[PDB]
Write a protein that holds these residues in place. Structure first.
Motif, PDB file in Angstrom:
ATOM      1  N   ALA B 159     -12.473  -4.943  10.628  1.00 48.62           N
ATOM      2  CA  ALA B 159     -12.139  -3.744   9.875  1.00 48.62           C
ATOM      3  C   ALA B 159     -11.902  -4.135   8.425  1.00 48.62           C
ATOM      4  CB  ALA B 159     -10.908  -3.071  10.456  1.00 48.62           C
ATOM      5  N   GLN B 160     -12.275  -3.258   7.500  1.00 44.00           N
ATOM      6  CA  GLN B 160     -12.126  -3.564   6.084  1.00 44.00           C
ATOM      7  C   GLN B 160     -12.064  -2.311   5.224  1.00 44.00           C
ATOM      8  OE1 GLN B 160     -12.620  -6.307   2.473  1.00 44.00           O
ATOM      9  NE2 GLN B 160     -11.258  -5.967   4.218  1.00 44.00           N
ATOM     10  N   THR B 161     -11.409  -2.449   4.076  1.00 46.50           N
ATOM     11  CA  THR B 161     -11.298  -1.376   3.099  1.00 46.50           C
ATOM     12  C   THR B 161     -11.592  -1.912   1.696  1.00 46.50           C
ATOM     13  OG1 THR B 161      -9.801   0.275   2.106  1.00 46.50           O
ATOM     14  CG2 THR B 161      -8.797  -1.757   2.941  1.00 46.50           C
ATOM     15  N   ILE B 162     -12.101  -1.036   0.835  1.00 43.07           N
ATOM     16  CA  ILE B 162     -12.387  -1.369  -0.562  1.00 43.07           C
ATOM     17  C   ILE B 162     -12.047  -0.177  -1.452  1.00 43.07           C
ATOM     18  CG2 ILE B 162     -14.116  -3.181  -0.266  1.00 43.07           C
ATOM     19  CD1 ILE B 162     -16.262  -0.910  -0.477  1.00 43.07           C
ATOM     20  N   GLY B 163     -11.839  -0.442  -2.738  1.00 38.88           N
ATOM     21  CA  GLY B 163     -11.521   0.607  -3.706  1.00 38.88           C
ATOM     22  C   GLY B 163     -10.055   0.630  -4.091  1.00 38.88           C
ATOM     23  N   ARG B 164      -9.621   1.743  -4.677  1.00 45.41           N
ATOM     24  CA  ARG B 164      -8.243   1.877  -5.155  1.00 45.41           C
ATOM     25  C   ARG B 164      -7.255   1.976  -3.997  1.00 45.41           C
ATOM     26  NH1 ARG B 164      -8.350   7.959  -7.985  1.00 45.41           N
ATOM     27  NH2 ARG B 164      -8.054   9.167  -6.053  1.00 45.41           N
ATOM     28  N   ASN B 165      -6.117   1.301  -4.155  1.00 44.87           N
ATOM     29  CA  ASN B 165      -5.085   1.204  -3.117  1.00 44.87           C
ATOM     30  C   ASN B 165      -5.605   0.615  -1.800  1.00 44.87           C
ATOM     31  OD1 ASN B 165      -4.276   4.312  -4.500  1.00 44.87           O
ATOM     32  ND2 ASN B 165      -2.970   2.509  -4.801  1.00 44.87           N
ATOM     33  N   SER B 166      -6.665  -0.190  -1.881  1.00 38.75           N
ATOM     34  CA  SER B 166      -7.235  -0.838  -0.701  1.00 38.75           C
ATOM     35  C   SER B 166      -6.289  -1.909  -0.158  1.00 38.75           C
ATOM     36  CB  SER B 166      -8.602  -1.452  -1.016  1.00 38.75           C
ATOM     37  OG  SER B 166      -8.518  -2.387  -2.078  1.00 38.75           O
ATOM     38  N   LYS B 167      -5.438  -2.440  -1.034  1.00 45.59           N
ATOM     39  CA  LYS B 167      -4.397  -3.391  -0.644  1.00 45.59           C
ATOM     40  C   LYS B 167      -3.462  -2.775   0.400  1.00 45.59           C
ATOM     41  CE  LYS B 167      -3.849  -6.181  -3.969  1.00 45.59           C
ATOM     42  NZ  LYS B 167      -4.654  -7.246  -4.628  1.00 45.59           N
ATOM     43  N   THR B 168      -3.109  -1.507   0.191  1.00 42.52           N
ATOM     44  CA  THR B 168      -2.195  -0.780   1.077  1.00 42.52           C
ATOM     45  C   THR B 168      -2.817  -0.490   2.444  1.00 42.52           C
ATOM     46  OG1 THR B 168      -1.280   0.324  -0.892  1.00 42.52           O
ATOM     47  CG2 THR B 168      -0.644   1.216   1.260  1.00 42.52           C
ATOM     48  N   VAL B 169      -4.045   0.021   2.446  1.00 44.66           N
ATOM     49  CA  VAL B 169      -4.740   0.360   3.703  1.00 44.66           C
ATOM     50  C   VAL B 169      -5.173  -0.903   4.462  1.00 44.66           C
ATOM     51  CG1 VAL B 169      -6.529   1.320   2.134  1.00 44.66           C
ATOM     52  CG2 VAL B 169      -6.983   1.237   4.585  1.00 44.66           C
ATOM     53  N   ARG B 170      -5.452  -1.991   3.744  1.00 42.20           N
ATOM     54  CA  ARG B 170      -5.712  -3.279   4.398  1.00 42.20           C
ATOM     55  C   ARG B 170      -4.440  -3.793   5.072  1.00 42.20           C
ATOM     56  NH1 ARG B 170      -7.241  -5.831   0.276  1.00 42.20           N
ATOM     57  NH2 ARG B 170      -9.448  -5.227   0.400  1.00 42.20           N
ATOM     58  N   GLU B 171      -3.298  -3.572   4.423  1.00 46.29           N
ATOM     59  CA  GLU B 171      -1.992  -3.903   4.999  1.00 46.29           C
ATOM     60  C   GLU B 171      -1.812  -3.171   6.329  1.00 46.29           C
ATOM     61  OE1 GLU B 171       0.356  -6.756   3.663  1.00 46.29           O
ATOM     62  OE2 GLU B 171       0.101  -5.403   1.954  1.00 46.29           O
ATOM     63  N   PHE B 172      -2.098  -1.869   6.315  1.00 49.08           N
ATOM     64  CA  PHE B 172      -2.022  -1.026   7.509  1.00 49.08           C
ATOM     65  C   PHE B 172      -2.939  -1.539   8.622  1.00 49.08           C
ATOM     66  CE2 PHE B 172      -1.351   2.879   9.849  1.00 49.08           C
ATOM     67  CZ  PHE B 172      -2.544   3.072  10.524  1.00 49.08           C
TER      68      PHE B 172
END
Ligand SMILES: [Mg+2]
Ligand SMILES: [Mg+2]
Ligand SMILES: [Mg+2]
Ligand SMILES: [Mg+2]
Lengths: 235, 240, 233, 212, 195, 231, 204, 244, 222
Positions: B159-172
């Motif tokens: 699973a992965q996320t990119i873009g703004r506030n991606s740090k937060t959703v990657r944390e999740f």
């Protein structure tokens, strides 16, 4: 600003010297040459636990008798690998034979200084090219973005290179077995790696005359890691 | 022709133009990718600063490269179209010469190669785009999810996320996604994808887009109401 | 691809004990018209080489300019241009041979047959042939066109193999060449009486003879020949 | 020339003659008309001998580059199409080629592609190419079954080349047999037609017209 | 290759194409499908010089499939036929022209109408109720002129097609090894496996 | 200072700093010695290693049967220039059936290096070369600088600490020029010359590299146990 | 073999009193084989009409080309192109393919919107303009059309009389040509109305 | 050499922005306001000419509203000369498509093509970008009536109502307030003119300072008509809506 | 019209022994009915223990040999003075020939030497680069006169063991270098008698592990 192919007052190319700094930031790759084969090992260094580590490909086949490990801006290596593979296959087509490891390495290193204002900058990656031919036997080369390549009995590149090289200085001798080399790469990788070494964040490979170039399974490497732990606890 | 070396090394060994391209990605709307046991879900953020928009015709964030592979992105929108076009052409070219559609890994490797090329070619700047490429290989039921970035490096992700506030959703995702047991169904996978976006999105109205890709070229985009039902169920469980 | 327009006939040559002899008549034919009577087809290069050319004269003049240009170029930044680094016959030939084969390979040949005669630095005789096809060969006697058919047989009676070369003097060799030129004048319809002859000797150097003529001709027997069979008067 | 290849239960049989002629003059009796592209792929040579040799050796190089890049065996479909697309670029220039690209993969099974210098690319079960192709076809068509054994299939391919070698003036010398399996091709020897003819005549009772 | 036929009936287009592939002296194949699906509701059959036929057909296929993905939309049969015509019209003045004749059978989902387009290697396009290429029309058109009706069912179209094929099998010198028949309608493209 | 940003810029005193910086790269390079007699010409090169595990960088390159050079500075630039020499030697042989004169080889290298000093975008070559050869006018030794300056010499040395070897050859001039028909003694003089440029380190078996060409001697390189004789 | 007579067909144009008429057959063939009876050879761009005979692929191509060009013309000029101007455009466009020409016989017909003057013109395949007052003919039965037009035509015919003259000129010419016929169309053009009539003729 | 004078038009800032695109957008913000409003039965294009003169020949003048084909029109905001270069390229693309497929070009395909051209100038070539923002008003049989906008970055988006040029912040708020989905053309005409009348930097909104257009299916039966309003017709609609 | 090709006659013969190889060729060079040279070497030592001859059109023959010799030189430069094996040389020559596929070298090329196991090797090429390792190969004008003789006397074709009457073949016993040279000389003596383009002289190059040796023999000069 300034030319891309400019010399510094010390007589060095700025861009080449700067690309060497990028390689220092890269993950560690180690190569050890023996009379039974050459071993290549790398630190994978996944940026997150969700990243599937087996998709990290920092050890690569060039031909059946030549392998390659990388360190630095690994994206830059793809065209170098493509050229190496093409050079190896093309020579076989023209001459009905395997290509010498040195000649392959020389072909790759010819690309290095083809930059200016050709590509816009040097490569930001160093390569450990390991292989075997009938003329000079088992060989390990270090291909830099300067266009220079040195042959090595053992070599480490990347962030933990100078520490690893000092360790390789003491440990390497001309009568090393393949098994001894495998454990030695694992030992030195474990030393310089930030995270704890296991079969998922580190990778082994070798090149032998009989079987050719082979990347090791995670199950095979795991046994060598367990064999390493026990022999270090043995004294 | 214009031959100027824009992407070059600095004394500390950095290529600032590639790094500044990542800053363009950081500014882009959030995109997330989650792969279940028999599916992959691509979630995308739509910033609600733009209303009076025509959502029928406005370029969708997720794009089909072929009938079995999709591509979402974060960063410069105009730049993404060039990568999408090249990818779509290569997908047809692959079918024409190899007589088999591209693997997800192959298509990723191609796009990543294009991005890399723009970091050491004269007279060009890097793409201000990171992509999430998802799908299923031909005659294969194993889910695939890959990420690319301006430098040209690519890799596979559970699973992965990119873009703004991606740090937060990657944390999740790092605490909520279990590798030993991924989202077994389409429902579970979509739910986890919506949940991850709700950490960042603001309102769960028209700000969340969801696209579900299943094996054998089974791709469908969820509607507003379908997504709204997930948003409703998530918060009702949260009130406890 | 072209066709030759103004043409030169046979070039003949042979090796002798101390060097080589080469000869060619002074005619530039325009088909069956004997158009130009003062054409020099032996072109010396330095004091050790003579290039004899037959075939298309416009191409001969081009080749003549290439050789002139070659001497100029060799002298550039060359303190030993008139000594150790002077042009050898072998250098001049290999250059021409390269050009001829390249031109045939572009389907635009120099329509010529060339014989490079000379003496090397070590005193060795040089005699080699090249033509519009880039075909090359060497022999104790060499001849182009009609010379190949009529001169070679006569010259080969003097020097039949390599071992005959040291036994052959310059007087015997020149005599054979001059006789061959007479035979060609009798029998080649595109030949002239006037010719040039060049001797390149390792001792006496390059001797270039212009305005030579075919002499001692036999024609008197023609008076007795009458009709074509039965006619008596 | 006579070359054939056919699909069956046990994979693919490839069989070829060995004769090369320049007009009526027999240039060679020991010519190799099976190109070993790689350990898994075979190609047959008819028409231009150089064209077939050169471009099918080149094909092997392309197949090697493919599996280095893709970390997977190239399909027979993809390998054959690399060759057909190549010769199609040269169409009109005067390439002369008639070949069967033969292989056995997991996803395809045993597969044969007839590839042509006119750009033709045909998948099929039985193919025969060359000046003696019609003779070989007769023996094949009347005796072929899918459920042939590897032993019988090998003999059928050998016997079909013999038929052509006998009647076709520009075919003969010797027979080269190959058996293509999923784990790679297996060479089944060189068989002199002179010795094979008399052997087959006696054991089989065929060729009664010929005195032996 | 040899014979390709087309007939547009009430609610579908039927394309019949021969199975034979002959390389001079021998019939190398008797099951060749001389057609490519360009889009879900558009089928193209083809005949002409060896190599060029398949190369052209697959090139067109790739281009239409590319368009389908880019726009997430199926081009109308008319639009596809115009694209194909232009490619052939471009080809005829090239260094080495595509020697390929095609029939394009499509069902227009917008208009709810079947459509048959005949295009030769020169780029000569015509929309027809029934069409053919090469010598096929010489044998079949008199039968089609007689029996054809615009309100024919698919089953009646197949019967009229059988009569055309029977006449071909009787009077043509070449053995074309029968035909593969395909139907294009609102539900897409399907093959009649028994003919 | 303000006039060293590229090779196309003269300084106010008429200097080309980029060329001078390229010249500096040679001084950083390992020492190599060249010397000749009337019959033979010899190259002696001190090879440099990265560390104890590494190999010793090769310094000498063969250009033809009768010609070759030794390098000091950027090795890739030497590979380019040597490749160019190989081609020019080869062109002379194929077209004119003529071995390329060593003096003419120097003229070609000069002109190739010069074009890189007068044009924008490029850079000077960052290597110095010592070309030896035996042609129709006997033995020859050349010194190439990437400024373009090529110089025919009896003996010389380039690289780090090369001044010591160069002074030695300047004293020994009258002796080593007379070493005719004796290859071993001429090499000895070269090994003794390069020894004047050594500090801390000494000439070992995989450290030393020697090459020779002469009257009846093709250009041949000696490495490994082949040079143990001269240590 | 001859590209201008593979497909067959004809076009004829005539001037009348305050009107022009242009007409064509409907046949498209592959030499002896009749392929289509609906292949119209007349096109129009605004009020300017263009007939094109010859190789059918080029007929189609040139129509698409002049549509393309007159559409851009209109966008830039902010007005519809006139017959005199379009005639020069057709000529220029054909001549640019001087050594690789379209195998066609174009025929322009129309009325100038400002002056009201009837205008016709013809071209050879390479762009040479024939600006006749009376009539223009083109196609595989051009000889037949020349014969018909020369005898039947008289100047200043009224629209409904001109229709009869041009129709009879076309029909009887087509019936003496194997590669023409299979239906016919006639356009009667006035300054602000155009009538199109399909003619009944023999279908062999 | 030449490097010294190179502005480097196609580079990222440290923040990840394209300098020249941002500065081109700043240029466009000083251009006359252009508004597009999409209704169920048509589209309205309204635009303000920049501080005109009494001697300007208005009836033959065109600086804002341009015709791409019979179905698609654009409103311009920025450098007029730059816009005309792009407009001519767009007109050709529409014709190329029509020639190829024998169908009028779908609106989005044309918009994507022009937007891709703009994008190219930001990524390669070392040239300055086009200082132009377009509003595309058009119709096709797939999506019906459509409004798009593109800017110098090459990014384009779809809209129900949108403004470009000066005072877009104020203009977009006013449109967002009064716009409804079931709105009709005659209502959209009124909204567009009312929005310009409030956002204008001029003292009063008059006919001589405006360009106006409508794309209507208000053409006889199933077809679309473009109407570029004449000076007198703009004067009439201003009186009808009650602005003058 | 200009014809870029010509026929210089000549005949060449390559025979592979057990631990040796010979490549022979006549020294006569001709056009039509004229002799150009009675001694024009046709078989060449190309280095690395390889011998070569490109028979047919002499200009293309010389060009090819020259380019191959050049290829040997550059093989040494590019690959650390590695010895070019006969099989590698053969593949290289294929590419040289096929390089001019559409304007061919009008020659029939033969090379000879030793393989990497030290056994005798001969390779035979057509004008456009199709090649093959062979035990025995005559090329050129009198090839049709020589090959049948070699089939019979080298490979013992159509020869059976007396008494058995066709049942047992004559065994393929290995020939010495002295035995091969006899067959070569008799092949050329016979070819000289019956072919007008063959004569003057015979030059044989013998390749062994010790190196390349030359032998010359007179032929009839008529
Ligand atoms: Mg290909
Ligand atoms: Mg047609
Ligand atoms: Mg008629
Ligand atoms: Mg009729």
């Amino acid at each position: 600003d300034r030319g891309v192919s400019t010399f510094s007052p010390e007589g060095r190319l700025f861009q080449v010297e700067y690309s060497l700094e990028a390689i220092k930031l890269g993950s560690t790759a180690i190569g050890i040459a023996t009379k039974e084969g050459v071993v290549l090992g790398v630190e994978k260094r996944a940026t997150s636990p969700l990243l599937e580590s087996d998709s990290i490909e920092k050890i690569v086949e060039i031909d059946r008798h030549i392998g390659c490990a990388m360190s630095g801006l690994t994206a830059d290596a793809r065209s170098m690998i493509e050229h190496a593979r093409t050079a190896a296959v093309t020579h076989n087509l023209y001459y009905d034979e395997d290509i010498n490891v040195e000649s392959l390495t020389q072909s790759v290193c010819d690309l290095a200084l083809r930059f200016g204002e050709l590509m816009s900058r040097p490569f930001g990656v160093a390569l450990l090219i390991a292989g075997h031919d009938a003329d000079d036997g088992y060989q390990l080369f270090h291909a830099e973005p300067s266009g220079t390549f040195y042959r090595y009995n053992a070599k480490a590149i990347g962030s933990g290179s100078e520490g690893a090289q000092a360790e390789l200085l003491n440990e390497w001798h001309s009568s090393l077995t393949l098994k001894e080399a495998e454990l030695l790469v694992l030992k030195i990788l474990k030393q310089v790696m930030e995270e704890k070494l296991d079969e998922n964040n580190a990778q082994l490979s070798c090149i032998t005359k009989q079987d050719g170039f082979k990347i090791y399974d995670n199950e095979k490497t795991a046994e060598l890691i367990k064999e390493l732990k026990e022999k270090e606890a043995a004294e | 022709g214009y031959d100027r070396a824009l992407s070059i090394f600095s004394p500390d060994g950095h290529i600032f133009q590639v790094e500044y391209a990542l800053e363009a990605v950081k500014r882009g709307t959030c995109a997330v990718g989650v792969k279940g046991k028999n599916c992959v879900v691509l979630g995308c953020e739509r910033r609600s600063t733009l209303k009076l928009q025509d959502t029928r015709i406005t370029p969708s964030k997720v794009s089909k490269i072929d009938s079995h592979v999709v591509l979402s992105f974060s960063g410069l929108n105009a730049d993404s179209r060039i990568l999408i076009e090249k990818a779509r052409v290569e997908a047809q070219s692959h079918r024409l010469t190899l007589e088999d559609p591209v693997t997800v890994e192959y298509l990723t490797r191609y796009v990543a190669g294009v991005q890399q090329r723009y970091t050491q070619s004269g007279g060009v700047r890097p793409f201000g785009v990171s992509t999430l490429i998802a799908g299923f290989d031909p005659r294969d039921d194993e889910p695939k999810l890959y990420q690319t970035e301006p430098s040209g490096i690519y890799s596979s992700w559970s699973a992965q996320t990119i873009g703004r506030n991606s740090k937060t959703v990657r944390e999740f995702l790092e605490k909520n996604y279990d590798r030993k047991e991924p989202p077994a169904t389409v429902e579970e996978c979509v739910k986890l994808t919506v949940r991850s976006l709700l950490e960042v999105v603001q309102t769960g109205a028209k700000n969340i887009e969801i696209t579900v890709v299943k094996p054998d070229s089974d791709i469908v985009a969820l509607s507003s109401e379908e997504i709204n039902q997930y948003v409703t169920q998530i918060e009702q469980e949260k009130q406890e | 691809t072209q066709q030759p327009i103004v043409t030169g006939t046979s070039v003949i040559s042979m090796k002798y004990d101390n060097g080589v002899i080469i000869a060619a008549d002074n005619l530039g034919s325009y088909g069956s018209l004997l158009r130009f009577n003062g054409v020099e087809r032996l072109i010396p290069v330095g004091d050790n080489t003579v290039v004899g050319i037959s075939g298309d004269i416009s191409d001969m003049q081009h080749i003549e300019r290439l050789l002139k240009d070659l001497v100029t170029e060799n002298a550039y930044d060359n303190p030993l241009a008139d000594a150790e680094e002077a042009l050898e016959p072998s250098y001049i030939f290999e250059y021409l041979a390269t050009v001829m084969y390249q031109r045939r390979s572009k389907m635009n040949p120099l329509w010529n047959a060339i014989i490079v005669a000379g003496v090397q630095s070590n005193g060795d005789q040089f005699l080699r042939y090249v033509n519009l096809l880039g075909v090359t060969y060497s022999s104790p006697t060499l001849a182009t066109g009609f010379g190949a058919h009529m001169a070679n047989p006569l010259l080969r009676k003097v020097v039949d193999r390599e071992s005959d070369i040291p036994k052959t003097t310059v007087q015997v060799a020149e005599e054979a060449i001059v006789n061959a030129m007479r035979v060609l004048y009798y029998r080649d319809a595109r030949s002239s009486r006037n010719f040039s002859l060049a001797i390149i000797d390792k001792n006496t150097g390059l001797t270039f003879k212009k305005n030579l003529q075919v002499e001692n001709m036999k024609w008197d027997f023609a008076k007795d020949i009458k009709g074509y069979g039965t006619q008596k008067i | 020339t006579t070359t054939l290849a056919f699909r069956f239960q046990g994979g693919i049989i490839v069989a070829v003659d060995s004769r090369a002629t320049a007009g009526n003059w027999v240039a060679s009796q020991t010519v190799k008309k099976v190109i070993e592209i790689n350990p898994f792929l075979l190609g047959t040579a008819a028409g231009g001998a150089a064209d077939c040799q050169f471009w099918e050796t080149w094909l092997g190089s392309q197949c090697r580059l493919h599996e280095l890049r893709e970390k997977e065996r190239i399909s027979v479909a993809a390998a054959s199409k690399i060759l057909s697309n190549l010769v199609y670029q040269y169409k009109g220039a005067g390439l002369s080629m008639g070949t069967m690209i033969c292989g056995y993969t997991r996803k395809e099974g045993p597969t044969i592609y007839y590839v042509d210098s006119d750009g033709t690319r045909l998948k099929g079960d039985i193919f025969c190419v060359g000046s003696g192709q019609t003779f070989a076809y007769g023996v094949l068509d009347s005796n072929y079954k899918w459920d042939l054994s590897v032993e019988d299939a090998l003999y059928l391919g050998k016997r079909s080349i013999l038929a052509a070698a006998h009647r076709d003036a520009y075919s003969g010398g010797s027979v080269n047999l190959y058996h293509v399996t999923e784990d790679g091709w297996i060479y089944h020897g060189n068989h002199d037609v002179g010795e094979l003819f008399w052997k087959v005549k006696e054991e089989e009772g065929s060729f009664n017209n010929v005195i032996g | 290759m040899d014979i390709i036929l087309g007939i547009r009936v009430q609610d579908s287009v039927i394309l019949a194409s021969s199975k034979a592939v002959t390389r001079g002296i021998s019939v190398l194949k008797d099951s060749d499908d001389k057609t490519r699906q360009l889009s879900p509701h558009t089928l193209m059959s083809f005949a002409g010089e060896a190599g060029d036929t398949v190369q052209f057909a697959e090139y067109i296929q790739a281009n239409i499939q590319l368009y389908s993905i880019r726009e997430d939309y199926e081009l109308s049969p008319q639009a596809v036929s115009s694209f194909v015509r232009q490619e052939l019209a471009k080809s005829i003045r090239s260094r080495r022209p595509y020697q390929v004749n095609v029939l394009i059978g499509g069902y227009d989902k917008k208009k709810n109408k079947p459509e048959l387009y005949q295009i030769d290697y020169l780029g000569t396009k015509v929309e027809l109720p029934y069409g053919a290429h090469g010598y096929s029309g010489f044998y079949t058109f008199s039968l089609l002129d007689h029996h054809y009706r615009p309100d024919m069912t698919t089953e009646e179209g197949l019967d009229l097609l059988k009569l055309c094929v029977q006449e071909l099998e009787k009077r043509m010198p070449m053995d074309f090894k029968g035909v593969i028949v395909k139907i294009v309608d609102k539900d897409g493209i399907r093959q009649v496996d028994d003919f | 200072n303000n006039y060293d940003g590229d090779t196309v810029t003269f300084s106010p005193t008429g200097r080309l700093f980029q060329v001078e910086y390229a010249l500096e790269a040679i001084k950083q390079g390992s020492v190599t010695v060249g010397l000749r007699s009337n019959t033979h010409a010899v190259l002696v090169a001190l090879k440099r290693n990265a560390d104890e595990l590494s190999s010793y960088q090769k310094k000498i390159i063969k250009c033809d049967e009768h010609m070759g050079l030794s390098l000091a500075g950027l090795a890739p630039d030497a590979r380019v220039l040597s490749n160019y020499l190989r081609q020019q030697c080869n062109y002379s042989s194929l077209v004119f059936n003529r071995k390329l004169a060593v003096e003419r080889a120097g003229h070609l290298l000069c002109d190739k290096a010069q074009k890189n000093t007068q044009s924008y975008g490029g850079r000077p070559y960052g290597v110095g070369l010592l070309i030896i050869g035996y042609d129709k006018s006997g033995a020859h030794l050349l010194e190439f600088q990437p400024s373009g300056n090529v110089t025919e010499l009896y003996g010389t040395a380039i690289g780090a600490r090369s001044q010591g070897a160069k002074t030695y050859l300047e004293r020994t001039l009258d002796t080593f020029i007379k070493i005719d028909g004796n290859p071993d003694e001429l090499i000895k003089a070269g090994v003794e010359a390069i020894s004047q440029s050594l500090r801390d380190e000494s000439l070992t078996v995989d450290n030393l590299s020697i090459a020779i060409v002469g009257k009846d001697t093709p250009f041949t390189i000696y490495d490994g146990e082949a040079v143990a004789k001269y240590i | 073999s001859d590209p201008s007579s593979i497909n067959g067909g004809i076009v004829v144009a005539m001037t009348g009193k305050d009107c022009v008429a242009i007409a064509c057959d409907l046949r498209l063939g592959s030499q002896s084989l009749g392929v289509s009876n609906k292949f119209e050879k007349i096109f129009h761009y605004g009020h300017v009409f263009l007939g094109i005979t010859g190789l059918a692929t080029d007929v189609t191509t040139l129509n698409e080309m002049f549509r393309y060009k007159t559409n851009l013309y209109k966008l830039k000029e902010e007005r519809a192109i006139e017959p005199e101007t379009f005639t020069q455009l057709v000529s220029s466009s054909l001549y640019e393919r001087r050594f690789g020409p379209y195998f066609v016989g174009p025929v322009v017909a129309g009325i100038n919107s400002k002056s009201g003057k009837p205008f016709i013109a013809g071209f050879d395949l390479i762009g040479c303009i024939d600006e006749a007052k009376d009539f223009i003919v083109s196609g595989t039965a051009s000889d037949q059309l020349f014969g018909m037009c020369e005898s039947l035509y008289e100047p200043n015919l009224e629209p409904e009389d001109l229709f009869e003259t041009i129709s009879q000129a076309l029909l009887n010419a087509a019936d003496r040509d194997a590669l023409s016929g299979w239906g016919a169309v006639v356009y009667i053009i006035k300054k602000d109305e155009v009538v199109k009539r399909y003619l009944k003729m023999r279908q062999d | 050499g030449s490097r010294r004078y190179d502005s480097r038009t196609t580079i990222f800032s440290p923040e990840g922005r394209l300098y020249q695109v941002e500065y081109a957008l700043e240029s466009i913000s000083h251009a006359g306001t252009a508004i597009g409003i999409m209704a169920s039965d048509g589209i309205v294009l309204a635009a303000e000419r920049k501080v005109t003169s009494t001697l300007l020949e208005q009836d033959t003048s065109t600086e804002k509203l341009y015709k791409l084909n019979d179905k698609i029109a654009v409103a311009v905001a920025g450098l007029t000369a730059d816009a005309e270069i792009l407009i001519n390229t767009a007109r050709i693309h529409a014709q190329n498509y029509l020639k190829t497929y024998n169908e009028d070009i779908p609106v989005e395909i044309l918009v994507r093509r022009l937007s891709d051209i703009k994008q190219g100038y930001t990524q390669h070539g070392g040239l300055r970008p086009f200082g132009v923002s377009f509003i595309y008003a058009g119709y096709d049989d797939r999506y019906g009536y459509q409004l798009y906008t593109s800017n110098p970055s090459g990014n384009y988006t779809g809209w129900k109502a949108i403004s470009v040029g000066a005072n877009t912040s104020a203009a977009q708020t006013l449109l967002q307030m009064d716009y409804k989905d079931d709105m009709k053309v005659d209502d959209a005409i009124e909204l567009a003119l009312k929005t310009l009348s409030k956002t204008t930097d001029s003292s009063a909104l008059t006919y001589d300072r405006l360009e106006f257009a409508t794309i209507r299916k208000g053409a006889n039966d199933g077809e679309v008509y473009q109407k570029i309003f004449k000076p007198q017709e703009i004067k009439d609609i201003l009186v009808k809506t009650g602005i003058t | 019209q200009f014809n870029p090709y010509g026929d210089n006659g000549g005949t060449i013969l390559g025979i592979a022994g057990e631990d040796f190889a010979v490549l022979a060729g006549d020294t006569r060079n001709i056009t039509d009915y004229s002799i150009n040279s009675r001694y024009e070497p046709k078989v060449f030592d190309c280095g690395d223990n390889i011998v070569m001859s490109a028979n047919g059109f002499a200009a293309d023959g010389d060009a090819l040999v020259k380019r191959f010799k050049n290829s040997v030189k550059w093989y040494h430069f590019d690959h650390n003075d590695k010895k070019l094996s006969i099989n590698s040389a053969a593949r290289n020559i294929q590419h040289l020939l096929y390089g001019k596929r559409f304007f061919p070298y009008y020659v029939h090329t033969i090379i000879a030497g030793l393989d990497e196991d030290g056994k005798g090797a001969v390779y035979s090429f057509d004008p456009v680069g199709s090649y093959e390792r062979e035990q025995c190969r005559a090329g050129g004008a009198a090839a049709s006169l020589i090959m049948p003789f070699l089939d019979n006397q080298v490979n013992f074709k159509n020869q059976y063991e007396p008494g058995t009457n066709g049942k047992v073949k004559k065994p393929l016993k290995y020939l010495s270098v002295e035995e091969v040279i006899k067959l070569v000389r008799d092949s050329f003596t016979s070819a000289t008698e019956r072919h007008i383009q063959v004569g003057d002289g015979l030059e044989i190059l013998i390749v062994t592990k010790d190196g390349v040796r030359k032998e010359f023999y007179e032929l009839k000069r008529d």
